[PDB]
């Protein structure tokens, strides 16, 4: 009984980054991250994912960013851009928010209960008042305008 057969002892998935248009231009600035947000289950899973963040306008957390609540119109009116590809939230609490990019609509999801690599229909529903325009299956956004 002294031969143990093959048995998997490690597994890693690897994905590429979220693609974007080269010719549309890049503009990004870093913001502090909200301590009251569980940033673990937003950067979880190796899949390419981008999501919208709103900033706090005033209060004790003014200047901190939180993921956008689509059912809160004040969170809708305070959106500032997107977080692309994630980073290590443990060693740093300062995320780089992309203010101008052009991303395909499959790589953007808001709910944690939303499948990766698929267009989130809640983002496509609220596309006008989030200042998103859908051209050729891509979101166009510039939050400097």
């Amino acid at each position: 009984d002294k031969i143990q057969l093959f048995r998997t002892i490690g597994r890693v998935q690897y994905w590429e980054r979220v693609p974007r248009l080269h010719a549309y231009g890049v503009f990004a600035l870093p913001f502090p991250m909200d301590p009251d947000v569980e940033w673990g289950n937003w950067f979880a899973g190796p899949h390419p994912k981008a999501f919208l963040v709103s900033v706090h306008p005033s209060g004790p957390k003014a200047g901190h960013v939180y993921p956008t609540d689509l059912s809160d119109p004040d969170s809708v009116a305070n959106v500032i851009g997107m977080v692309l590809d994630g980073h290590d939230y443990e060693a740093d609490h300062n995320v780089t928010v992309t203010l101008r990019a052009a991303v395909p609509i499959e790589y953007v999801q808001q709910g944690i209960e939303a499948p990766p690599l698929q267009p989130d229909p809640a983002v496509l529903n609220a596309a006008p008042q989030l200042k998103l325009k859908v051209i050729k299956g891509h979101y166009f956004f510039d939050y400097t305008r």
Binding site: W15, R17, P19, K136
Partner: protein, 51 residues
């Protein structure tokens, strides 16, 4: 099968197997006076086992 010799009392087998990304993704259809579009994201993965 023929015979070998190891000078060791136990033998272990490690198998590093890789499932790389296939080169699919044909080419997008363009017209001469416009700008391009980006290429989708691929997946590669590794796995390793023991006997």
């Amino acid at each position: 099968f023929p015979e070998d010799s190891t000078f060791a009392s136990e033998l272990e087998l490690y198998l590093l197997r890789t499932q790389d990304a296939e080169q699919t993704g044909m080419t997008f259809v363009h017209q001469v006076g416009s700008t391009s579009l980006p290429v989708e994201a691929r997946v590669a993965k590794v796995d390793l086992a023991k006997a």
